[PDB]
Design an enzyme around this catalytic site. Sequence first.
Site, PDB file in Angstrom:
ATOM      1  NE  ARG B  69      82.920  60.267  -0.187  1.00 17.67           N
ATOM      2  CZ  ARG B  69      83.735  60.905   0.653  1.00 17.67           C
ATOM      3  NH1 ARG B  69      85.030  61.001   0.394  1.00 17.67           N
ATOM      4  NH2 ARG B  69      83.235  61.453   1.750  1.00 17.67           N
ATOM      5  CE1 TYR B  73      79.319  62.457  -4.049  1.00 19.92           C
ATOM      6  CE2 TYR B  73      78.477  60.346  -4.804  1.00 19.92           C
ATOM      7  CZ  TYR B  73      79.523  61.244  -4.685  1.00 19.92           C
ATOM      8  OH  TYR B  73      80.744  60.917  -5.205  1.00 19.92           O
ATOM      9  CE1 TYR B  95      87.313  71.615 -12.396  1.00 23.16           C
ATOM     10  CE2 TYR B  95      86.774  69.276 -12.334  1.00 23.16           C
ATOM     11  CZ  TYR B  95      87.636  70.300 -12.699  1.00 23.16           C
ATOM     12  OH  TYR B  95      88.821  70.041 -13.340  1.00 23.16           O
ATOM     13  CG  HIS B  97      77.629  69.736 -18.121  1.00 27.99           C
ATOM     14  ND1 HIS B  97      76.560  69.287 -17.360  1.00 27.99           N
ATOM     15  CD2 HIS B  97      77.125  70.077 -19.331  1.00 27.99           C
ATOM     16  CE1 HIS B  97      75.458  69.337 -18.075  1.00 27.99           C
ATOM     17  NE2 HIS B  97      75.777  69.815 -19.301  1.00 27.99           N
ATOM     18  CB  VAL B 100      79.322  65.695 -17.148  1.00 27.44           C
ATOM     19  CG1 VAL B 100      80.419  64.741 -17.610  1.00 27.44           C
ATOM     20  CG2 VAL B 100      78.478  66.164 -18.329  1.00 27.44           C
ATOM     21  CB  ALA B 127      86.911  67.229 -18.312  1.00 24.56           C
ATOM     22  N   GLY B 207      93.587  69.595 -18.565  1.00 29.20           N
ATOM     23  CA  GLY B 207      93.327  70.998 -18.843  1.00 29.20           C
ATOM     24  C   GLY B 207      93.685  71.865 -17.640  1.00 29.20           C
TER      25      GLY B 207
HETATM   26  N1  LIG Z   1      91.264  69.635 -15.540  1.00 25.45           N
HETATM   27  C1  LIG Z   1      90.944  68.488 -16.142  1.00 25.45           C
HETATM   28  N2  LIG Z   1      91.588  68.149 -17.286  1.00 25.45           N
HETATM   29  C2  LIG Z   1      91.266  66.997 -17.888  1.00 25.45           C
HETATM   30  N3  LIG Z   1      90.371  66.082 -17.528  1.00 25.45           N
HETATM   31  C3  LIG Z   1      89.740  66.449 -16.396  1.00 25.45           C
HETATM   32  C4  LIG Z   1      89.962  67.600 -15.663  1.00 25.45           C
HETATM   33  N4  LIG Z   1      89.131  67.636 -14.546  1.00 25.45           N
HETATM   34  C5  LIG Z   1      88.429  66.530 -14.629  1.00 25.45           C
HETATM   35  N5  LIG Z   1      88.756  65.763 -15.722  1.00 25.45           N
HETATM   36  C6  LIG Z   1      88.180  64.476 -16.090  1.00 25.45           C
HETATM   37  O1  LIG Z   1      86.821  64.463 -15.703  1.00 25.45           O
HETATM   38  C7  LIG Z   1      86.544  63.237 -14.999  1.00 25.45           C
HETATM   39  C8  LIG Z   1      85.313  63.399 -14.122  1.00 25.45           C
HETATM   40  S1  LIG Z   1      85.442  64.739 -12.932  1.00 25.45           S
HETATM   41  C9  LIG Z   1      84.872  66.217 -13.837  1.00 25.45           C
HETATM   42  C10 LIG Z   1      83.377  66.211 -14.102  1.00 25.45           C
HETATM   43  C11 LIG Z   1      82.814  67.579 -14.518  1.00 25.45           C
HETATM   44  N6  LIG Z   1      81.411  67.715 -14.047  1.00 25.45           N
HETATM   45  C12 LIG Z   1      82.847  67.750 -16.046  1.00 25.45           C
HETATM   46  O2  LIG Z   1      81.947  68.367 -16.616  1.00 25.45           O
HETATM   47  O3  LIG Z   1      83.750  67.312 -16.762  1.00 25.45           O
HETATM   48  C13 LIG Z   1      87.858  62.958 -14.281  1.00 25.45           C
HETATM   49  O4  LIG Z   1      87.877  61.588 -13.897  1.00 25.45           O
HETATM   50  C14 LIG Z   1      88.851  63.283 -15.406  1.00 25.45           C
HETATM   51  O5  LIG Z   1      88.923  62.218 -16.327  1.00 25.45           O
END
Ligand SMILES: Nc1ncnc2c1ncn2[C@@H]1O[C@H](CSCC[C@H](N)C(=O)O)[C@@H](O)[C@H]1O
Lengths: 373, 391
Positions: B69, B73, B95, B97, B100, B127, B207
């Site tokens: 990974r 990156y 995807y 924020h 995060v 999320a 979500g």
């Molecule tokens: N559609 C969704 N619904 C709920 N939790 C989600 C999701 N997509 C991602 N997540 C959560 O987000 C975690 C990190 S991945 C998403 C990171 C993204 N940058 C953000 O701002 O949230 C995943 O391990 C999961 O716990």
Amino acid sequence: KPGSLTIAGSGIASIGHITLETLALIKEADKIFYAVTDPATECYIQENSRGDHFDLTTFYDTNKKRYESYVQMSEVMLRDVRAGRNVLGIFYGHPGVFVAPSHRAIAIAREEGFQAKMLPGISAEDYMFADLGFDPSTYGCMTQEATELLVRNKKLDPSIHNIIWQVGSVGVDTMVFDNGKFHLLVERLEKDFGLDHKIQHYIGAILPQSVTVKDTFAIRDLRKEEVLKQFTTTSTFYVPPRTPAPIDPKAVQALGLPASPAYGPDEMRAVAALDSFVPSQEKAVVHASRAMQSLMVDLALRPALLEQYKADPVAFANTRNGLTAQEKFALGLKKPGPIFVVMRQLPSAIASGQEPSQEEIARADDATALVLA
Amino acid sequence: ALKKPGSLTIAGSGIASIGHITLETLALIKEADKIFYAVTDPATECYIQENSRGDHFDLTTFYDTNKKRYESYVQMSEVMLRDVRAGRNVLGIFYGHPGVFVAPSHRAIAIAREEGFQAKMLPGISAEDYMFADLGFDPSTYGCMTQEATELLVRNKKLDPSIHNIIWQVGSVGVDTMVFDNGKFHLLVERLEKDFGLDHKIQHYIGAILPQSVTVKDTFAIRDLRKEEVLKQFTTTSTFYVPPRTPAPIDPKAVQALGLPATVTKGAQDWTGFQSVSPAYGPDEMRAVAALDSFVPSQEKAVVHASRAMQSLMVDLALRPALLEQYKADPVAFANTRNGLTAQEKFALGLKKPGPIFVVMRQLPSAIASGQEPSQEEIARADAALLVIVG
Ligand SMILES: Nc1ncnc2c1ncn2[C@@H]1O[C@H](CSCC[C@H](N)C(=O)O)[C@@H](O)[C@H]1O
Ligand SMILES: Nc1ncnc2c1ncn2[C@@H]1O[C@H](CSCC[C@H](N)C(=O)O)[C@@H](O)[C@H]1O
């Protein structure tokens, strides 16, 4: 069952933080109730609306309990819902984060049998992550309101990220903010982190003319008159961890896990290999008709259309005759996995004129996603 | 005060396809020289391409099995930085924020700044943000701890049962790569069992990404978490919400010390049903409702009041970074190019401070009626909307 409640946010920065789905709602709603923090955003909401709107902030007063204001804010929205209007509430930031009237109004609307929902908005925390440039997820991140942490006698955990909101309103239940009890928060900070630990005072830029505030202060400076003065009702504190909790090697093992200059050897390798990397396997690329793209945008931004689609997906697909037969089939299933299959295809199959099979579409896994940790 | 320097902006797409994109992000999509993106759904991807100047690159092309990974990156960061160095206005989109759970974004911004480039991260819908809206709780009511499942376990952290807890990445405990597995999920369940007991309930949250997705928000008792029909539901997009089991009492002595009235005996209300819910219309609420229609504020409130020129400019500055840069470089000269502005607005803008803007863009209706404008002094002097209370 006429009448509905949607609550959305405007984010923190004037205009720019509004989400596309929220702008769409502003245009469609019967009536908008809003509580925002700057005139340009206020004007923007009014000008994009059908012209029926109400400033919720009119319920505040200097010596009035904010709780009473909040109950009134919820109530004006609910009155219009009961009258059968499609009501939009807009609160700055995220409308569910440090906002009492939103959750209240949605719960009451639902109890009375009306449709109600909340949309997310950009919060002050979201703004802080972007501005201060730390990743929660590293260490983990605790959110708390300054008065709440004090009245419940909580301790701050110095091994994690801590974010403290409403630092400028400690112990205030009205609208007079004099920092009369700010010293009580300082005491909590002193006890949990010591006098030498450094915090950041954060105020994200509201207007184009604003400058981000991200000043660092040692805890020992927080009782200084010249420092104290700077903490307003807009202020949030970021408290970085003093000591991260150590890695437990036993947990590492149980999880089955293995037991800084910008361009080190590892990075230089990665960079050298960049231009030549060839994947193990062919990756799918986006491949969708104009009809499919038009429809997917419509479904994202037009709730009436999404409702129509959900009611009868096959019939709805049949109103868009620009769709390929495979796209129509996928859409008729009303599931996410089929969408992924039709909208992304291997370049080798695109060149072959080969469309995914009924079996490939119907077999799709409802998951997906990519992690960037 | 620049002419052809590259710049880096990293933004989010949010979680829901298309609808979570912010206005400033869409504006940059349209204006950027080059877009690098890593998004989760094809509709969002097509939307970004179709709105762009047609120069874009899918960052996820650097993923591959057998490939670590971290190498991906570094490559992701590097492709962005190269274009910045070549003098391009570069946008990266991730995807949610972009700060995060995203390594390449922070790396890219750090290096860009070190090399003297303007580099900025824009917030996006996380999320967590989606969760607050869908599950209908406020982090403020009890405080809210957010953390990743593997990290919680690896550092032997305890979960605090008096607060809201959000646990990310429950669906891939202790495994990244792509072999997304729930073999180590039982370790998280043990943690939950220890901290909350077997009868406490969690919510499993996903979500909706696509219009075709349905929100997952099922409640499970911790005792159920090892059941085959329950385990089967957890995926890589799964997040858990653990509501407080044992919220701490309001300390009447602490209330006293804070100068709050002795009527403050309960915390702010949570409406999820996980806590005991007071009647929506008790005596206090009924009093506020009865008082609503006849409420008159102690002092007259200002209303928004600004020229078309002022509103047009403020929208432009919000959405057009090149224009904002020009304005910042010479505010007085910039203001003079918008002759529809009032004298007061021009003066306020020339100061390039937020306080003056509030003065000219809001006015008392009485002052409006009598056509009185704020004085140069009122403008030049730059010396609240709180929506929650503990009581
Ligand atoms: N559609 C969704 N619904 C709920 N939790 C989600 C999701 N997509 C991602 N997540 C959560 O987000 C975690 C990190 S991945 C998403 C990171 C993204 N940058 C953000 O701002 O949230 C995943 O391990 C999961 O716990
Ligand atoms: N511009 C800003 N910069 C930093 N923190 C801010 C801010 N505006 C609001 N806040 C924080 O939010 C508190 C108000 S409570 C409302 C928060 C809003 N719903 C949101 O999602 O962000 C403030 O006391 C402060 O802690």
